[PDB]
Design an enzyme around this catalytic site. Structure first.
Site, mmCIF file in Angstrom:
data_model
loop_
_atom_site.group_PDB
_atom_site.id
_atom_site.type_symbol
_atom_site.label_atom_id
_atom_site.label_comp_id
_atom_site.label_asym_id
_atom_site.label_seq_id
_atom_site.Cartn_x
_atom_site.Cartn_y
_atom_site.Cartn_z
ATOM 1 N N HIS A 71 102.742 51.922 23.509
ATOM 2 C CA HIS A 71 103.643 50.888 24.030
ATOM 3 C C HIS A 71 103.609 49.638 23.151
ATOM 4 C CE1 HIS A 71 104.621 52.801 27.994
ATOM 5 N NE2 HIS A 71 103.493 53.435 27.729
ATOM 6 N N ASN A 144 105.747 53.056 34.902
ATOM 7 C CA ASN A 144 106.717 53.597 33.957
ATOM 8 C C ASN A 144 108.105 53.534 34.580
ATOM 9 O OD1 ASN A 144 105.484 54.115 31.538
ATOM 10 N ND2 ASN A 144 105.052 56.276 31.956
ATOM 11 N N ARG A 199 118.533 59.687 32.122
ATOM 12 C CA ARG A 199 117.688 58.499 32.200
ATOM 13 C C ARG A 199 116.587 58.484 31.148
ATOM 14 N NH1 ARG A 199 117.294 56.872 38.634
ATOM 15 N NH2 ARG A 199 119.208 57.949 39.292
ATOM 16 N N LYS A 233 113.183 49.464 42.295
ATOM 17 C CA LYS A 233 114.431 49.987 41.755
ATOM 18 C C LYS A 233 115.345 48.844 41.345
ATOM 19 C CE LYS A 233 114.975 54.010 43.548
ATOM 20 N NZ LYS A 233 115.539 55.147 44.326
ATOM 21 N N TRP A 299 106.350 62.188 45.918
ATOM 22 C CA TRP A 299 106.418 62.284 47.372
ATOM 23 C C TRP A 299 107.874 62.348 47.787
ATOM 24 C CZ3 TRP A 299 102.414 58.053 49.233
ATOM 25 C CH2 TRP A 299 101.145 58.434 48.788
ATOM 26 N N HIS A 301 111.416 61.960 49.485
ATOM 27 C CA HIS A 301 111.920 60.829 50.262
ATOM 28 C C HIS A 301 112.140 61.201 51.723
ATOM 29 C CE1 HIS A 301 113.629 58.621 46.470
ATOM 30 N NE2 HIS A 301 112.309 58.608 46.530
ATOM 31 N N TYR A 354 91.794 50.512 29.672
ATOM 32 C CA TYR A 354 92.582 49.325 29.340
ATOM 33 C C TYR A 354 91.726 48.122 28.950
ATOM 34 C CZ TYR A 354 96.961 51.516 30.730
ATOM 35 O OH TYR A 354 98.060 52.336 30.802
#
Ligand code: HEM
EC number: 1.11.1.6
Lengths: 497, 497, 497, 497
Positions: A71, A144, A199, A233, A299, A301, A354
């Site tokens: 990244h 992500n 996407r 979103k 999971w 919806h 990290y």
């Protein structure tokens, strides 16, 4: 011109009627002249006593810090997270105390495999990192643009990355490595399906969704714990670039996303993301058909609807890119009281990976960098002197614990949640787990037929460069997913050869 | 496929009939399993005692070293320099002792402003670095694909670079910065003319010429010194890419030069460059119309013809790119006896700048890296322990000088050449020197009319993005060069607006 | 003079009849003169073009690497471990294959709290680190001269160290910090009793015992596992320095141990340590009266006798101290197949702490330093490029796993031993465990009365500087150990005040 | 107890009536418990998800930064420089504008050859570093307690240091190296005479004089330049420790000077040094009997009397030692307008050596450390991003020069003073210069007979350990100084053998 192009003109304008500052060395001494060097006459050799030249030249020589291992190429923005719904029954996190609470946030978008200075409009998972400056420290939600990942075991993460980056000998992009690794690890079939779909190349960073992608543990004040999945979103709608337009933009503007975000923030159209959480109970986790901590699984919806929490608004552009975007550090281990880690193996690996790479890339005291400081919190501990310590070093406070002099004491209300785990302590194989069911559901339920054709055509266009046996293994995995998938991919590969 | 694509297949083939080695940790302990992690049961948290995972993960976290401040994106090759002519009357350098002497060389091609992972086919000066492993140490001839540079004063080099790289706030490429700096410094008019000509985008690294670009000092055994300019022209012929084909390749293959060189070396067509020197005497330097040490000036071929010395052949591809191309260090201060520095201010700045950035980027002991070692020489001095010392540290030899125990002694025959320089010691202005004569000669003597039109069209296509006053200053400089130059550029700019 | 003083004379002698080598720069260029600098005349300023001066001066400026966080001041030696007894029924470790097997070893002695350049004859735990170069990699047995430690929880280790080192504000040694921490943590009462006894100041490094001090896990070829404790007792006999003679030597020879070891190895009297193991079964561990993994507890000799294995002989002095003693890295996580970690919390903390500080102090590639390399083993993995990579970087071998090209594969016979652990996953308090029983046994069974008086007098002489309430807490802990102990300490403290 | 011992008690007292702060991680998250680790049950292995433990442990592992290459062991204080006399006719430096001007200063005392943690009362030159925070940046007057140095050529400085520090193989102090170097370089005879005199072991840091020791260039507003020598003599009187008392204190209190300074500042008795300057004109420098820029020569008081300027008062102790004493950086190249460098070769070497070692030891951005910042000045330049940048990075200001957007501009009134230097540019030998005249003057004019006997006895006591020929060379140099000197030294050496 767009506001991104007029950076220097704007800086000059908002500094009107002011005389230019004095040009100084690093130590504040005024520079008499910084356009010529001290020589022995007009055509003589340069002197050591030219301290200005050697000062600026050494600072120029120490300009590059190591790029992120993954990244690297990224953009940054700042804004606030505003709580719009009450989830206090799930988490006692101060970030979610009451309605209307605004917490400052720093956000970084990135491309996983691109190096610093590569094309922005490429098919690659986009990373969305958020740093909340909660009164209880910083919370790093590092997700992500996809709700899953390629693998499910952290011990495979370097290798995977090594396959996605350049060849060790030729330093070239190698589809052979990519597809060899992907065909030897069928647990990627899901994320690859997300990667080569529409996407896979989002249109900028404002037209993509964000996913923490991990199961987390929400703990309430009464001590009960639930499992969670953070979604956020885009309110600007999902929008993707075609393969041809992306290939064009790669040579037209290799910094497409950075410019798009900068202009959108500079023209007032502040982008926003709405925050949701999927919630699961412990018995629900023990009765889940798959592993609820599997990173390659979602999971559904219908069984776990999204619960709104708040919204993420980005309103400020970085003043200096390096000081605020290139030096910002996101540690998934930074979780305030109320949010905890899950038995998800990948989250366990990220808990360690990290801070280590942050101490390597930025330095041992990287949490003293202003963008990384929990400036909306109070740091007080027994961690002491390191390289580049730019604080009081906590003064003359005692540096050992426990003591008898009133140094910082542990807060017993911030204890972690306890869970009993059974079974032996060894390495458990998870490569043979289910790898095709959710992939088949996404293939035959979410996508339409033209989207399926575009997915297969993208997969074939990328895979055609690998060897024949690697293509056979990949198409075998795709066929085990669903016969139409592998059939179309194999037909397109035959057409390519 | 081309030999670059078959790297792994070839590595597997030349390792046929051999069993795979044992997978070990960094300390040589055999790894029982590197596909799963130690957890508390099948769905349990990860353990600290998993030393294999944390070992490989920390080594992965410390994979990136800082990229070069300039010339980051590059390719590497290896070969030999073979002497074909006798210049012993000019230099006592062991690299030029006798005919047929072959000296190992390591060569790196690079792009000055592109970061690691940027496009290869871009309009930018290409750097050509050669490291000769002479018996008298390493000789680093670090030149460009152009015989000149943009500026003539090292104190301007960081600023220039800052203008050629991304904006400090937006992190975008800014033609405003580029052309503001270029118009405020007219001494660039020459190199810009070379940059926007046809040879601004060479076709790979084998179809471009190389130029040390600096005046050097050649000293013979008898002690007389002359001034020199090292050229090395391609034996494969000069070949350049069109703007449209370069723009296409930027998105098709951003690693065009690396792949081209790798394939040319792997298919046997070893590229070669023929080595020339321009020689000048001291009275000739004192009677030169311009400053013979000016980096923006050339030596005309009619007054100083090229004298052949040898040829540069590249026959070996790097085994590992990082260990041999990314970690190779070129220090212009590495000159064997017989070659010395000139009063050229830019060479004086480079004498200091390179070891500093090498100690920052690679480490204090970067000369212990195998590609940087003078392996064809004997290192013996009083330089001692530093970070990452991978030698005997010269054993128990005395570490102070002078001593009375037979430690390395100075060789009085390697003394530098003495020259008397007069005039006061201060900063002498050179911005007002001649900036248009050689530019006009290159414009109206070397280029034809269609090449002039292409040059002006490239300049205008790049400059059209700057502000109006910056365009006016640039076109004013171009008009002061020659009226047709600025006239065509201004007409094209008017057409663009 | 002693052989330590005649180092340079000996180096000159064994180099007789040879001319002094050529004085070169770091890049191998011969130095004409290294006794004067390039100036503008006899009384002129120095020039930048003096590359020799700036080269050696920068290498001098980068001479210091960070000292070890603990155990900075130390000495080093080399030798072999020779197996003299068959313990193959306990461990399948290649270091213990057959009788007479000699494995090269590197040993470092150190003082825990002394900085680089402090006195050697001080009351402080002495660390004994051994690195075995087994065919299965390196094995780092990093023990102390005491079979226990002060604490039993790794989360307390920094704080403890902070109390043993200088005050954060005054930079002075503070008995207040020391005794405040020791009185607030009664689990130190045992090790303090070992620290202020006669063996707190050993006479050199050859007259002290060595103790791995941790429980380890021995695994045989058939898969059964036992618990172990590594001892290695000096064959030169235990010998200690009096407080007065130690105080004298502190100002006479602050490098007493280094000189003693160097002279003993240079005069042929090779010191030796005999290797023992205490063995315990799993049901014995579950029926142990104390925690068998408690670092503050020992295994009584009557219930667990010592089993001889081999002997440790040190025969070679380091050629260069920095390259072989200051840069050697000991990682307790370096265990070959057959030796594994125990649920001992301190060993768990050490499994992580050491490679981290090694990557900070030496660098990411510290395992490439010749003293740290497993030169008697074969390193082959997918760990790739880092800062200061001085190898082939494993060539063009594939860098991802799993692959299909014959890269190193995991050895399934090196799998770890599995054990089932029950109970919840949280932080368990161990400060309230037993702290006085083994201390009382050592006080009233091992020591005689004059040794008890000397112990109490040393404790009081050190403690008299702390505040009154800290003295009261310390003496309260000592009284809870045994009334005579605290009674004598309190009487001596009253006499001191 | 003395105020140094009551640091923690005082910190607790001035924090009375306040509850202890919350114990947090580096990122500000509250710590639930920092006394136990997360294990799998009461006797289980440690978990990776224990982020608190690994955080504090990694910060503990990155606590040590490299010690100073020389002058490691040191103490620090803070105060003000107050101008008491008008020297504006000599220098236009803002630090010397008007009477009564108080400038903040930071002072560090140190021992040249002692490592961090060595004895303080040892025979060694004491360094006195002052950092003035002038409105025109920082001014670093980095002098010694002696008006001269051992050598006069910077190219000899590493070697000298290597001789004064430990043997490369044995890591022991070697009088052989020391006296071999000193006898091979007779230009040390002066400083050695100062080193083994009574003032070789000063009594603390408040009873010693300070000497910039270099010739500097003072420039007035009208542009005339003079040569200068900065002195600052102690107002507490010169006081020295006997050899026996120093040897005692070495084992009693190895931190004697630190404690002395801390107590003197904490009990109100602020130490003070009175500031003088010796002034010389240019024709006086050209008619000086010796080299006025020779570092081994002094300016006689009869020919150049001291001119008072101001006084140095130290009133504040450091709050945290590491953040203010260990991380403070003194760069002799930091000179405000009005003070400039001299043709003194040693000053020329120091102009380069110090920023290099500061970028190595502290980091590229060490001027961002609060103690190193010119906080009483305005930093504005085009120096940009580096490792650990903790500022705004100068925001979005243009980073290239010259520009057209109002960025910092050079101040033409801060130009350096110009001087014409003649003679060829080469290495001029200065080892054969005068080495005994000023030494003889100090021996037979300043010292009395008992001081001469003590000097000779100290020299002999140190030299008796070297070889016989080294003793002969040293005594030969001492005899060439004056027959009584070498005669007494040789008699004492004969008595010793
Ligand atoms: C939680 C407990 C402990 C931790 C976190 C810890 C940590 C460390 C660290 C960071 C170093 C520095 C090494 C380097 O920088 O190269 C070190 C060195 C050392 N430790 Fe420990 N330590 C612990 C307990 C122990 C124990 C129990 C022993 C012996 C039984 C021990 C013996 C040593 C020795 C001998 C060294 C010197 C290494 C060398 O000389 O290269 N320590 N330790």
């Amino acid at each position: 011109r767009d506001p991104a192009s007029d950076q220097m003109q704007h800086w000059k304008e908002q500094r009107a009627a002011q005389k230019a500052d004095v040009l100084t060395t690093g130590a504040g001494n005024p520079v008499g002249d910084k356009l010529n060097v001290i020589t022995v006459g007009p055509r003589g050799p340069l002197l050591v006593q030219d301290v200005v030249f050697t000062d600026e030249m050494a600072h120029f020589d120490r300009e590059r810090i190591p790029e992120r291992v993954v990244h690297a190429k990224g953009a940054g923005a700042f804004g606030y997270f505003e709580v719009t719904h009450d989830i206090t029954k799930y988490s006692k996190a101060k970030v979610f105390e009451h309605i209307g609470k605004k917490t400052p946030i720093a956000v970084r978008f990135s491309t996983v495999a691109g190096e610093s200075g590569s094309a922005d409009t490429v098919r690659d998972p986009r990373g969305f990192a958020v740093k909340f400056y909660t009164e209880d420290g910083n919370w790093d939600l590092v997700g992500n643009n996809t709700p899953i990942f390629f693998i499910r075991d952290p011990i495979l993460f370097p290798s995977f990355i090594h396959s996605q980056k350049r060849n060790p000998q030729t330093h070239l992009k190698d589809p052979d490595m990519v597809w060899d690794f992907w065909s030897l690890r069928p647990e990627s079939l899901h994320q690859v399906s997300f990667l080569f779909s529409d996407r896979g190349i989002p249109d900028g960073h404002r037209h993509m969704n964000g996913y923490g992608s991990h199961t987390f543990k929400l703990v309430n004040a009464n001590g009960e714990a639930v499992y969670c999945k953070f979604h956020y979103k885009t309110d600007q709608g999902i929008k993707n670039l075609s393969v041809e337009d992306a290939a064009r933009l790669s040579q037209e503007d290799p910094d497409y996303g950075i410019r798009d975000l900068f202009n959108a923030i500079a023209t007032g159209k502040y982008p926003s993301w709405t925050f949701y959480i999927q919630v699961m109970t412990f018995n629900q986790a023990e009765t889940f058909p798959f592993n609820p901590f599997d990173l390659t699984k979602v999971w559904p919806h219908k069984d776990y609807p999204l619960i709104p929490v708040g919204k993420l608004v980005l309103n400020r552009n970085p003043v200096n890119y390096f000081a605020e975007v290139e030096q910002i550090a996101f540690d998934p281990s930074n979780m305030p009281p109320g949010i905890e880690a899950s038995p998800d193996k990948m989250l366990q690996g990220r808990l360690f990976a990290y801070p280590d790479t942050h101490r390597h890339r930025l330095g041992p005291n990287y949490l003293h960098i202003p963008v990384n400081c929990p400036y909306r919190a109070r740091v007080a501990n027994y961690q002491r002197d390191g390289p580049m310590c730019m604080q009081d070093n906590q003064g003359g406070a005692p540096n050992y614990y426990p003591n008898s002099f009133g140094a910082p004491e542990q807060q017993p209300s911030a204890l972690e949640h306890s869970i009993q785990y059974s079974g032996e302590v060894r390495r458990f194989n998870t490569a043979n787990d289910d790898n095709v069911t959710q992939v088949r559901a996404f293939y035959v339920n979410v996508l339409n037929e033209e989207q399926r054709k575009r997915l297969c055509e993208n997969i074939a266009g990328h895979l055609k460069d690998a060897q024949i046996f690697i293509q056979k293994k990949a198409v075998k995995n795709f066929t085990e997913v669903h016969p139409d998938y592998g059939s179309h991919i194999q037909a397109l590969l035959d057409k390519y050869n």
